[PDB]
């Protein structure tokens, strides 16, 4: 049952909190979170704050939960939308994986993308192209947040 | 005095002691409850969640007899 | 020199290594303890992904650093 | 530490009746030191037998080491 | 009621049983605490096997009385 | 290894003293070792013990132990020479049996014959026709030994 999976990442995740990320329920449903990740030290995502939103279906932890960007991101597999295109996110799903592990693994994909299979067609080309373009294009949108 | 017991009889699924716990092929134990649920909501491969050994068709898998008695008697340590 | 690798399920072993050693021999010992091949592991340290072939010291690796163990993902 | 005496004989392979060396655990559920497995069937080839309930495997089973089941031993005999 | 079973590698374990319980009963208890079926089992009491489908009762097994597990034979 | 395999067996078979049966090396080669066990109460066998050497291959316990009656009995599976034509004692051996469980085997099957596929093939057809007889003929070879 997911509720009780989702409680105890929650006492764990408050009783040691993680250097990558910090993460919490809204309101009074702990099935829907607010997440807020911090860049890679050495990228165009510097000190950038990124929020997320995590929404845990009713089956957790055997389907897992949607997550997306609310600050906008320049990312070849991050739309406008914050939509997320990525495999542990789908197919490649583990029960095994917790939120924090999940959002760790979201931290590592920004300095890792896959431009052969976008979600940003435009994006993943200049990053192909011209990634010095790319790098100010992304350090530019941390600045902003936007 | 404990504790490194309590989290390896922990199931990676649901984060408590193993329930009547069934291994893996490739060495890796879930509560028979948690490895069912996870590989009945899928088909295709059948991957373990912690390591992704792939498994054409379902692992047929009976639960771990030796993991049974030293969960059960790592509880009663725990109690006393 | 002893570096610690936080596994898949939040617990934490410890493994000793040299500044020389690859990330590829790293993941041998991690696949000895755990059992998660080396191509289904995903090291991460300060925010980035750890490559084979490279040593802990081109990532700046020292004394009782710790190590990040996640499943190996793709970008879509 | 140990708070658990009778952990011995549960942690005690029914081949070589000492401690498990590297165990794995057989898809009938059932450990063993991955020696003394191996030993068992490179002598009994042709369909393989569990040792402990004679659960029969036409083609030889490709186990790994169960880590759990090692991190116990380990932690019982460094007590 | 309390009977006591020799397992195959010699460790003892305990079942609460009934004089009305059959062999085949006990054998599919003995099969939930050591994962053997019970058509792999063969019991053994007064130096005797003891038949499925009989009781305890008709072998005369009392309370704290010690059952012996070996692996089904078959003379020649 | 088999000696301290063999050592351990009996290092427990002298905490274990199992009913029926009694073993233990004579002399000081571990692997030849001297079995009694008990005829089973209520049955032709009953009062009666019976002698027998247990020989351990170098592969045990990945091979069976030659065990042989040197103690005359009457069963259909036993023959003059003391040879028991037992499954656990060839192909279906198992590395998890241990002496203490296969000398408690066989005394289960003296009190459970095959006669159909016999070693001695007469015995065991008095077994088939008359198992009064049998039970007659078997107790008295237990008290003539
Ligand atoms: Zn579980
Ligand atoms: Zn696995
Ligand atoms: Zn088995
Ligand atoms: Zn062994």
New interface residues.
């Given amino acids: 049952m997911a509720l009780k999976r989702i409680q105890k990442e929650l006492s764990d995740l408050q009783r040691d909190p993680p250097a990558h990320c910090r993460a919490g329920p809204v309101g009074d449903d702990l099935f829907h979170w607010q997440a807020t990740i911090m860049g890679p030290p050495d990228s165009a995502y510097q000190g950038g704050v990124f929020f997320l939103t995590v929404h845990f279906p009713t089956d957790y932890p055997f389907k897992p939960p949607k997550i997306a960007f609310t600050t906008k991101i320049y990312h070849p597999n991050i739309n406008s939308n914050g939509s997320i295109k990525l495999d542990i996110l789908r197919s490649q799903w583990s029960p095994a994986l917790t939120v924090s592990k999940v959002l760790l693994s979201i931290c590592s994909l920004l300095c890792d993308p896959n431009p052969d299979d976008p979600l940003v067609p435009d994006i993943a080309q200049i990053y192909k192209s011209d990634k010095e373009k790319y790098n100010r294009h992304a350090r530019e949108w941390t600045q902003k947040y936007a | 005095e404990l504790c490194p017991l309590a989290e390896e009889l922990s199931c990676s699924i649901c984060l408590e002691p193993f329930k009547e716990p069934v291994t893996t092929p490739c060495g890796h134990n879930f509560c028979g409850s948690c490895l069912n649920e996870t590989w009945a909501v899928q088909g295709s491969p059948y991957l373990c969640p912690q390591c992704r050994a792939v498994y054409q068709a379902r692992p047929q898998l009976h639960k771990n007899t030796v993991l049974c008695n030293v969960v059960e008697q790592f509880l009663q340590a725990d109690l006393a | 020199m002893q570096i610690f690798v936080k596994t898949?399920?939040?617990?934490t072993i410890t493994l000793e290594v040299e500044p020389s050693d690859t990330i590829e021999n790293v993941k041998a010992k991690i696949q000895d303890?755990?059992?998660?091949?080396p191509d289904?592991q995903?090291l991460?340290f300060?925010?980035?992904?750890l490559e084979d072939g490279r040593t802990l010291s081109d990532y700046n690796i020292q004394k009782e650093s710790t190590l990040?163990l996640?499943?190996?993902?793709?970008?879509?």
């Fill in positions: 898949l399920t939040g617990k303890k755990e059992g998660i091949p289904q995903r991460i300060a925010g980035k992904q990040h996640v499943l190996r993902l793709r970008g879509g």
